Write a protein that binds this ligand. Structure first.
Ligand code: U76
Ligand code: U76
Lengths: 303, 303
């Protein structure tokens, strides 16, 4: 039946993207009700970026210094504040397309859709994971800042991510919609370290289950293992330690397949220890960790 | 900056999806102006599927036998015809959300976004290639039939694909919107062969260029090659033969990188002959052929 990297439909979020301009800097804003959210570094100059005092930079700016463009229509800014690393622009006009929405801080290992935007126009949509080190493996060029990540909950959009920066590793960092960075990152042009990039173990198990449901079951061995024994081998390969919570989350996938979580851990252990010998699992020659159990169920149940 | 499998924004296509029901069969329709398009096998019973005479099956049906539901509203069917393997239902109400659109037959090697739908509700969106053997590597469960593939041309939606069937290989087949199958497939439950699944060579070169633009350039060797010499090695590995058209399409990527197409062919030759030695290119341990040159430029230029 197939297994694919799948984003949520983007339409509800498309009608929320606007253009925000301050001096020479143009980027993306999120227009919900009568508030527009964007990265505060919209106020920064080329050289301000080395060590900006946002409080002093923001103080030289008034309502009329912000150009907020929905399509071809200019909105009137009647208020501004800084919340952490986001600028909230109060506007005269409530977005008539505002969907039912929430702001959530996502946890590491969870996935969301990114609607990649330039000049407040939606460009494309792809799925990302908040990696254990609070980075994402995105596709973000000059102009993409203010692009948002989100989940759809039948009708309700859960915004979880706003894009701010690229790290030397070719990897991306940003905030929740209250403007708190995921991870230790700051919005300034300085040397910044993402930690060691550990693998989301529960996600790899979900993906090996997806493989089995789709008839790909060569990597299944005659062995079994224990939490402590598997987790000794995880540690060696920079895998997140598997917990009983993780085992319980996988139970619907165990139940559907008839393969005990611990039997799947044994298979994973030998793949980690032996490699794949030029063989592939769901069209990949490496172990994929950017699918959650929910993602696997959703796609293998048809939500 | 990153390189990712990216779909078009789906919103324009979301407002075009309806539910089509005939007897016990429910699937997806495309509502454009006052016409609804869907797979003709909507009229089929469990056993009709072995060898259906669609003409005779369609003759036992009237306008009122078709239930077309846009959200919670029933549309009135005032006409029906069969065009090849699609049913066109004429409806009283023109879709008020009809975008500027075209129907195109895509060529093999070109890519499109699939909006995976169940019960006329959009589920998710992912990018596919029409493979040389006229199959796609999708994610399609019971209920997905009538889901469409499309390109966006600034404002104009180019619908190219409607989903009909799964092949034994776990691989998918369907029609253009005039109801002509891509490839030799027929809408009946019989043993059907996709041909040998050849690699789209121009796409792999585009992807090796994308790798280089994103700073991943280990697979570059000190050698060069000729069309005829590379194409002798392509043949061995079931790669599409590279033509001077293919070379010309890649020129903007050559020009931006300073790497001659033929120098990139030499790199590809040694990867095909030597493998990757457990190394990765853009996070893949195999050679990716589902990105076109346009896709690479679009993502590496920010369209
Ligand atoms: C957005 O602000 C944006 O799109 N702005 C509109 C173009 C005006 C961009 C998005 C980046 C740009 C390229 N691809 C992206 O995702 N972000 C920034 O400009 C960041 C602003 C900071 C204040 C957060 N920014 C500035 C630079 N930071 C830097 O040099 O850090 C040290 C560094 C980083 C690195 F990756 C390698 C190094 F060796 C050193 C550049 C990176 C960045 O994201
Ligand atoms: C749609 O019609 C659909 O979603 N219908 C709504 C559920 C009522 C489905 C989509 C398929 C179903 C599972 N995943 C899909 O993508 N298509 C069909 O039902 C096809 C109808 C035919 C008339 C085209 N269909 C029927 C079966 N065909 C078959 O058995 O062919 C021989 C075969 C195929 C195979 F893959 C392996 C074999 F060993 C033999 C099943 C497959 C199919 O797509």
């Amino acid at each position: 039946s197939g297994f694919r990297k799948m984003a949520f439909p983007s339409g509800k979020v498309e009608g929320c993207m606007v253009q925000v301009t301050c001096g020479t800097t143009t980027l993306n804003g999120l227009w919900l009700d009568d508030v527009v959210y964007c990265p505060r570094h919209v106020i920064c100059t080329s050289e301000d970026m080395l060590n900006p005092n946002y409080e002093d930079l923001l103080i030289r700016k008034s309502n009329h210094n912000f150009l907020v463009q929905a399509g071809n229509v200019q909105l009137r800014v009647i208020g501004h504040s800084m919340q952490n690393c986001v600028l909230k622009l109060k506007v005269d006009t409530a977005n008539p397309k505002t969907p039912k929405y929430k702001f959530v801080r996502i946890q590491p290992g969870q996935t969301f859709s990114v609607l990649a935007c330039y000049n407040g126009s939606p460009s494309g949509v792809y799925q990302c994971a908040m990696r254990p080190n609070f980075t994402i493996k995105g596709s973000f060029l000059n102009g993409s800042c203010g692009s948002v990540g989100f989940n759809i909950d039948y009708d309700c959009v859960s915004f979880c991510y706003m894009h701010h920066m690229e790290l030397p590793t070719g990897v991306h960092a940003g905030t929740d919609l209250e403007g708190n960075f995921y991870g230790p990152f700051v919005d300034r042009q300085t040397a910044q370290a993402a930690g060691t990039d550990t693998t989301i173990t529960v996600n790899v198990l979900a993906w090996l289950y997806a493989a089995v449901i789709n008839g790909d079951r060569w990597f299944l061995n005659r062995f079994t293992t224990t939490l402590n024994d598997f987790n000794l081998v995880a540690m060696k390969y920079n895998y997140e330690p598997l917990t009983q919570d993780h085992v319980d989350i996988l139970g619907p996938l165990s139940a559907q397949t008839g393969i005990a979580v611990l039997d799947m851990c044994a298979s994973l252990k030998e793949l980690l220890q032996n490699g794949m010998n030029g063989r592939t699992i769901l069209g990949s020659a490496l172990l994929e960790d950017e699918f959650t159990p929910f993602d696997v169920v959703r796609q293998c149940s048809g939500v």
